[PDB]
N, CA and C atoms as an extended XYZ file, in Angstrom:
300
Properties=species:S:1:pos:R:3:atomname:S:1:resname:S:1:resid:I:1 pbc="F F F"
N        92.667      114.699       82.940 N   UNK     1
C        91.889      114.599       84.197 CA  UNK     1
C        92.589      113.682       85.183 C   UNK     1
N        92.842      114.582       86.407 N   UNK     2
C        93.363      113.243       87.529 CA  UNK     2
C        92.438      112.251       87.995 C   UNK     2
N        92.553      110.957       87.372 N   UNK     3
C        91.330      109.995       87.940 CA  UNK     3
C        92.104      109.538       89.438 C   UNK     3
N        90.792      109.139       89.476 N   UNK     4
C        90.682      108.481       91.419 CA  UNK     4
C        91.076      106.816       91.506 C   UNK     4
N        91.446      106.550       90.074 N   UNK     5
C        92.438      105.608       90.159 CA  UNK     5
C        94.364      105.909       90.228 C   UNK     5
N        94.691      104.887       90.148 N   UNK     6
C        96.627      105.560       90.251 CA  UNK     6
C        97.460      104.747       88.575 C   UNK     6
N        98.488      105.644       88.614 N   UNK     7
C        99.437      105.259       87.069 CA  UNK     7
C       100.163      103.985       87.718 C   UNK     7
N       100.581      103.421       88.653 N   UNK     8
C       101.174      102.598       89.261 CA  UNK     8
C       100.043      101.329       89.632 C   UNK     8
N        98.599      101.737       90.143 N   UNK     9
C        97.204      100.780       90.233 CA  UNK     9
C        96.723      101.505       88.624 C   UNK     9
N        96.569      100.379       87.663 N   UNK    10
C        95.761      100.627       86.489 CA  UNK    10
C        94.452      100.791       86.777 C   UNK    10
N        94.168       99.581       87.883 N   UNK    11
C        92.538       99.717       88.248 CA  UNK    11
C        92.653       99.483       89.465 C   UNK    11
N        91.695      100.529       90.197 N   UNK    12
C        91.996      101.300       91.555 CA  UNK    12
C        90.276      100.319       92.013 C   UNK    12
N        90.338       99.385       93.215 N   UNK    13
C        89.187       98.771       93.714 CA  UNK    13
C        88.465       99.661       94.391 C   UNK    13
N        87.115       99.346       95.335 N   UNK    14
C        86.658      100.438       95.751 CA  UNK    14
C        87.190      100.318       97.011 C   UNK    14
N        88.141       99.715       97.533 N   UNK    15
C        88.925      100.699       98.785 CA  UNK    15
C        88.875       99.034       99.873 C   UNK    15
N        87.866       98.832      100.418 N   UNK    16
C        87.051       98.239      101.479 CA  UNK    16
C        87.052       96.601      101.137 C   UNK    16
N        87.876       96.418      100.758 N   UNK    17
C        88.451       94.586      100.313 CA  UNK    17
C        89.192       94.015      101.324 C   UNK    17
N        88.909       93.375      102.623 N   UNK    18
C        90.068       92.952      103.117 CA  UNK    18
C        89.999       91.106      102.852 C   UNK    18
N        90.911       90.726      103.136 N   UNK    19
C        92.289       89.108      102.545 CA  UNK    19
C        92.031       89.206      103.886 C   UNK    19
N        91.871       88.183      104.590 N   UNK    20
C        92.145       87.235      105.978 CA  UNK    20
C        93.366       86.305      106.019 C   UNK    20
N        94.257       87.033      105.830 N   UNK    21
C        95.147       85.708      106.103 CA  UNK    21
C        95.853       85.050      107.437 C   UNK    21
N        95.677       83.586      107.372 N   UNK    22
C        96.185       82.558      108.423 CA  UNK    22
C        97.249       82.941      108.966 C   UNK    22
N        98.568       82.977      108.307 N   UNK    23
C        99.419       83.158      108.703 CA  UNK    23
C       100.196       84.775      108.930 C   UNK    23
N        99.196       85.692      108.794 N   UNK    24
C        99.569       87.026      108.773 CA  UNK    24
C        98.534       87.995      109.264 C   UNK    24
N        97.993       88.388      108.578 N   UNK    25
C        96.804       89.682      109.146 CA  UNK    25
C        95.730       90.150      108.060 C   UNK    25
N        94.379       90.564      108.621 N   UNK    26
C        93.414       91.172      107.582 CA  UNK    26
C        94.201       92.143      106.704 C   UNK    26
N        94.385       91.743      105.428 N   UNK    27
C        94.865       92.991      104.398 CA  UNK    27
C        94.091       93.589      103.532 C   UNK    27
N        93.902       94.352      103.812 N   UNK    28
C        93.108       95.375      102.525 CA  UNK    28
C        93.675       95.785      101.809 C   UNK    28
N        93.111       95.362      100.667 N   UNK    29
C        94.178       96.273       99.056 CA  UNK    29
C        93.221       97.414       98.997 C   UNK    29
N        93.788       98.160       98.055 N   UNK    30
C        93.149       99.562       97.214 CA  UNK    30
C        93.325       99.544       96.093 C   UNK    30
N        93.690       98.549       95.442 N   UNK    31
C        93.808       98.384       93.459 CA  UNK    31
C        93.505       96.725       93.247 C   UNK    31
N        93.196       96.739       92.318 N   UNK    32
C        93.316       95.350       91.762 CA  UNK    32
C        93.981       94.726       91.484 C   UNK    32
N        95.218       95.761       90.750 N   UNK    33
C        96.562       95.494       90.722 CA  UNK    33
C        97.199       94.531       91.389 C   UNK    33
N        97.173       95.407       92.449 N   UNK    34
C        97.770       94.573       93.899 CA  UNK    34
C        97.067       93.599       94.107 C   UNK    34
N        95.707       92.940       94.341 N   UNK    35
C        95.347       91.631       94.697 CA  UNK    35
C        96.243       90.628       93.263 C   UNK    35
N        96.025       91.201       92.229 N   UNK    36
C        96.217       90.311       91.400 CA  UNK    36
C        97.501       89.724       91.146 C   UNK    36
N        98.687       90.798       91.757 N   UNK    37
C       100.304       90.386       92.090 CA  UNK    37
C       100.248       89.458       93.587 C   UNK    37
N        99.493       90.045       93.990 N   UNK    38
C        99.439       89.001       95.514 CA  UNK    38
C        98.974       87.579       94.984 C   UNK    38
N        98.044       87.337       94.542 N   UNK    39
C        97.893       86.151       93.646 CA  UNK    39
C        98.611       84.920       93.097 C   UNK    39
N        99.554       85.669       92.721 N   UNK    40
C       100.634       85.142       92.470 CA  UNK    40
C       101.880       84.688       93.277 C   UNK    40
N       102.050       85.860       94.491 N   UNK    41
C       103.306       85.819       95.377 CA  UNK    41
C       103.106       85.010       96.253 C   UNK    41
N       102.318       85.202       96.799 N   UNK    42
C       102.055       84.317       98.319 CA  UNK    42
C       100.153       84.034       98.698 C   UNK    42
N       100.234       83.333       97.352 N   UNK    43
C        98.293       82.824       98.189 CA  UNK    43
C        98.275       81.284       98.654 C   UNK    43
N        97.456       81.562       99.262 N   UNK    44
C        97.960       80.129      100.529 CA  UNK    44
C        97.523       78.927       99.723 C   UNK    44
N        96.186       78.715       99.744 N   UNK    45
C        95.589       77.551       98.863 CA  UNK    45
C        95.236       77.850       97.770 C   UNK    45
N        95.946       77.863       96.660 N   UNK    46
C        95.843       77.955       95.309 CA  UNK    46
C        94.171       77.575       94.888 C   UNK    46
N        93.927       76.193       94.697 N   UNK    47
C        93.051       75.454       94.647 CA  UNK    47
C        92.747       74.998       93.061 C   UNK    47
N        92.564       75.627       92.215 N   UNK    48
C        92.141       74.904       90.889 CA  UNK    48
C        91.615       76.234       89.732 C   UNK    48
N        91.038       75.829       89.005 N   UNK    49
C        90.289       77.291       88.142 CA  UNK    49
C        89.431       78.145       88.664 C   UNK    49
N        88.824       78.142       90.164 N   UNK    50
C        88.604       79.005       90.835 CA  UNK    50
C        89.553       80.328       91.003 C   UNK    50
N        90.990       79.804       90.997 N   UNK    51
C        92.097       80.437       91.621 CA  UNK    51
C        92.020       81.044       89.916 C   UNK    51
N        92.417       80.413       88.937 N   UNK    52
C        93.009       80.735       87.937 CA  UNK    52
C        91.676       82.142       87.549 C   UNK    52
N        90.148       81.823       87.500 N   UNK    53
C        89.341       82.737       87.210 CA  UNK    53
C        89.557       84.711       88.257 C   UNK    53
N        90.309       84.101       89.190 N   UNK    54
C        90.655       85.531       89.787 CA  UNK    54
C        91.876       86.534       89.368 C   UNK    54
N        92.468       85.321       88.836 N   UNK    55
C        93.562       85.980       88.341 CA  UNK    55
C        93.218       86.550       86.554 C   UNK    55
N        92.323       86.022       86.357 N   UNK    56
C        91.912       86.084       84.948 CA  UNK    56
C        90.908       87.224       84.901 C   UNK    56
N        90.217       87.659       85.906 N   UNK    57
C        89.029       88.735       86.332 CA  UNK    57
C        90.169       89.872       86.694 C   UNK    57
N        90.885       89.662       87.339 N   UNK    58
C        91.886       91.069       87.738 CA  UNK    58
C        92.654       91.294       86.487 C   UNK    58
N        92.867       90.583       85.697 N   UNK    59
C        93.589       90.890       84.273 CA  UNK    59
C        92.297       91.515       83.209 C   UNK    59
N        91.314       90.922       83.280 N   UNK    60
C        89.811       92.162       82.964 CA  UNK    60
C        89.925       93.356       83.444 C   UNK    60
N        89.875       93.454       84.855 N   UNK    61
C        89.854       94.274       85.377 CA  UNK    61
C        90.652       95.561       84.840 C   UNK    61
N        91.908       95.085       84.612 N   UNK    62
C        92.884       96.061       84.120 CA  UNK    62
C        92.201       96.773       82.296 C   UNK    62
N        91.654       95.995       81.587 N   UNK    63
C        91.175       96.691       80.660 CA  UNK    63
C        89.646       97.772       81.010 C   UNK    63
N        89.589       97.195       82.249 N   UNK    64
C        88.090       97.987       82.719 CA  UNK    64
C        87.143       97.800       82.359 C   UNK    64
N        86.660       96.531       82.156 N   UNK    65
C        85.503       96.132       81.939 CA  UNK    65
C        84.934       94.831       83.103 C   UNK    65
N        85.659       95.201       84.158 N   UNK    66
C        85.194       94.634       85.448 CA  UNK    66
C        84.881       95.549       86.784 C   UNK    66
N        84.045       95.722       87.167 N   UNK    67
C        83.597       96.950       88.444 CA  UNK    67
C        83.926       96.316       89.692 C   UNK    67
N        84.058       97.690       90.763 N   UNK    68
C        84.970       96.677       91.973 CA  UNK    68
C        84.012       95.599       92.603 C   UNK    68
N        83.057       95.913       93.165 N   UNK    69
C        82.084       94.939       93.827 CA  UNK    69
C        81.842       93.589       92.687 C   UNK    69
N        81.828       93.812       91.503 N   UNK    70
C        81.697       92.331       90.342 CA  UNK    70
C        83.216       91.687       90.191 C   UNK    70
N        84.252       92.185       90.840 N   UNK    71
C        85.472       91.508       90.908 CA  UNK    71
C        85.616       90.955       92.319 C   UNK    71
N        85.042       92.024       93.108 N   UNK    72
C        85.118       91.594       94.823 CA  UNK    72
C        84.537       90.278       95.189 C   UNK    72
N        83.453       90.329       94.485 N   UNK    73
C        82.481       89.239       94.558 CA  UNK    73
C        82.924       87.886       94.580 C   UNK    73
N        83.707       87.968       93.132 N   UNK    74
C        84.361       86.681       92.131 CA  UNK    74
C        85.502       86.522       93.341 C   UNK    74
N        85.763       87.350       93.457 N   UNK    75
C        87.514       87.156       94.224 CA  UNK    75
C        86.788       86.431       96.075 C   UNK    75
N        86.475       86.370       96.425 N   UNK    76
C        85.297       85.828       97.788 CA  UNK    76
C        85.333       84.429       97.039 C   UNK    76
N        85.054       84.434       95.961 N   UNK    77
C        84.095       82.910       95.228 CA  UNK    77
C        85.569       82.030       95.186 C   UNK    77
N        86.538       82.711       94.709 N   UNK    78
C        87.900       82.129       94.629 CA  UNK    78
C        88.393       82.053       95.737 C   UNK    78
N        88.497       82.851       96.668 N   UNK    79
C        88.365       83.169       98.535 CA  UNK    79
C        87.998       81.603       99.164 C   UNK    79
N        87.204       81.057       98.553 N   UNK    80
C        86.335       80.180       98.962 CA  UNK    80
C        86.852       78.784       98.546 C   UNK    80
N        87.197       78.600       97.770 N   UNK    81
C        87.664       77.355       97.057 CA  UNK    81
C        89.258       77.326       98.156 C   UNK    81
N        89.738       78.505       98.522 N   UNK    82
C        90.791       78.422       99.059 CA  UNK    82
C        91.118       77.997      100.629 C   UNK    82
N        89.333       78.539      100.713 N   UNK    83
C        88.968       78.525      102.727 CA  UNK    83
C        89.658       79.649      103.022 C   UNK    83
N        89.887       80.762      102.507 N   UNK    84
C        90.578       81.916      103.178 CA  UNK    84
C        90.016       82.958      103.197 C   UNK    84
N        88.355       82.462      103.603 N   UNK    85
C        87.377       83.797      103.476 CA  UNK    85
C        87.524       84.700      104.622 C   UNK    85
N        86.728       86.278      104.287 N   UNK    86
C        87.119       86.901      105.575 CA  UNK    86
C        85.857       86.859      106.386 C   UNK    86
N        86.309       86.457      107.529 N   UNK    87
C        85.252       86.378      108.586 CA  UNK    87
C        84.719       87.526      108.701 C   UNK    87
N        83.400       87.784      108.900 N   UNK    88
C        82.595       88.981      108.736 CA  UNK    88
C        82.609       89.830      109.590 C   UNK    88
N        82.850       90.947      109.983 N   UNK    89
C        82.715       92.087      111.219 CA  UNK    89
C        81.445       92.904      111.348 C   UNK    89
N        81.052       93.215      112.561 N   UNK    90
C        80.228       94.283      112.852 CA  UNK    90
C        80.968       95.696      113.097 C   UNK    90
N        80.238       97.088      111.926 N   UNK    91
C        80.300       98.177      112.769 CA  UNK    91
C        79.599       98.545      114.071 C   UNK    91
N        80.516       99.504      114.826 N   UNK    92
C        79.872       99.378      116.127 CA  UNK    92
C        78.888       98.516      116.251 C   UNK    92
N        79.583       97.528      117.215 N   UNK    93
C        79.114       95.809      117.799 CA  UNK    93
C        78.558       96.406      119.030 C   UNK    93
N        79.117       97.681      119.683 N   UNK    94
C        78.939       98.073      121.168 CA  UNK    94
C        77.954       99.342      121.570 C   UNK    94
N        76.461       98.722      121.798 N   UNK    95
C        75.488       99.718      122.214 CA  UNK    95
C        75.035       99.946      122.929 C   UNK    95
N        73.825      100.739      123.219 N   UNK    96
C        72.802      100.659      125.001 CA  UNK    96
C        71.817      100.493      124.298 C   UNK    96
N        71.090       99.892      125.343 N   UNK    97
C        69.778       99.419      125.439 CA  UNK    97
C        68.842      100.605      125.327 C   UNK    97
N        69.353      101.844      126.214 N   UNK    98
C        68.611      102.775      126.708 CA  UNK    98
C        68.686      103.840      125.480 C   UNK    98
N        67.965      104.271      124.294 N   UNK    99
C        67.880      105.294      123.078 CA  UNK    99
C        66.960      105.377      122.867 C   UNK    99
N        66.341      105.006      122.277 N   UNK   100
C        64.782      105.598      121.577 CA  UNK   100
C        63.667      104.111      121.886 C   UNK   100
């Protein structure tokens, strides 16, 4: 069966994750994979076992016994210890007054 994950992403996130970073741009991954090598390469404020529990949840992850929103979550919580949360957006921010 072709799963809707990838052989290259072991575990495929649900899509809609974006990283705020300071010195670069909102990044959205699509695997876990990938946050969890980013982790390693270039995360800005490490911080302590916050940091270490994300990297330890995306290595769950890979056996699949972590779901994307219960890793997304954790990974925000580690986000946090770092100060590199993502500032929140509105869909369409831009409406009329005049509808129903």
């Amino acid at each position: 069966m072709e799963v809707q994950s990838m052989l290259l992403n072991d575990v495929k996130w649900e899509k809609p994750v974006t990283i705020s970073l300071q010195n670069g741009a909102p990044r959205i991954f699509n695997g876990v994979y990938e946050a969890f090598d980013f982790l390693q390469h270039e995360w800005p404020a490490r911080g302590d076992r916050a940091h270490e529990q994300a990297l330890r949840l995306c290595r769950a992850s890979l056996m699949g016994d972590v779901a994307g929103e219960i890793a997304r979550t954790a990974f925000v919580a580690a986000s946090r210890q770092a100060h590199c949360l993502m500032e929140d957006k509105a869909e369409a921010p831009n409406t009329i007054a005049s509808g129903s």
